[PDB]
């Protein structure tokens, strides 16, 4: 697996029952978020680890056809059949880097 981008963001998941965003892994703070490319079968995954204690807070597949919503210039989100994910980026540059890699992955899938 090869990393195609690194971006700083607070990883959130939506708690629909309470209509509230909550920190991924239950750990508030920023993470280093990668998109990893597995060339063997041309698959991509979003993997993020807390800057402080290195806990993996997100490890989710990027499926072909995903709708990646750039809600704001610093908060992007997407959903799968089970959860809604949100990335509150530390800067617009981080958001642009990550969106570029995401949009690339969705183009080559």
């Amino acid at each position: 697996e090869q990393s195609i981008c690194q971006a700083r963001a607070a990883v959130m998941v939506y708690d629909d029952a309470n209509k509230k965003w909550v920190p991924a892994g239950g750990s508030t703070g920023f993470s280093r978020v990668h998109i990893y490319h597995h060339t063997g079968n041309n698959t991509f995954r979003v993997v993020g680890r807390k800057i402080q204690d290195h806990q993996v807070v997100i490890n989710c597949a990027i499926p072909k056809g995903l709708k990646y919503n750039q809600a704001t210039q610093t908060f992007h989100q997407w959903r799968d059949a089970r959860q809604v994910y949100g990335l509150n980026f530390g800067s617009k540059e981080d958001a642009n880097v990550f969106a570029s890699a995401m949009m690339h992955a969705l183009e080559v899938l």
Binding site: A10, K20, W21, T28, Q77, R79, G86, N88
Partner: peptide, 8 residues
């Protein structure tokens, strides 16, 4: 798709 400091 859902739309705070309280949450952060």
């Amino acid at each position: 798709x859902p739309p705070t400091e309280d949450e952060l």
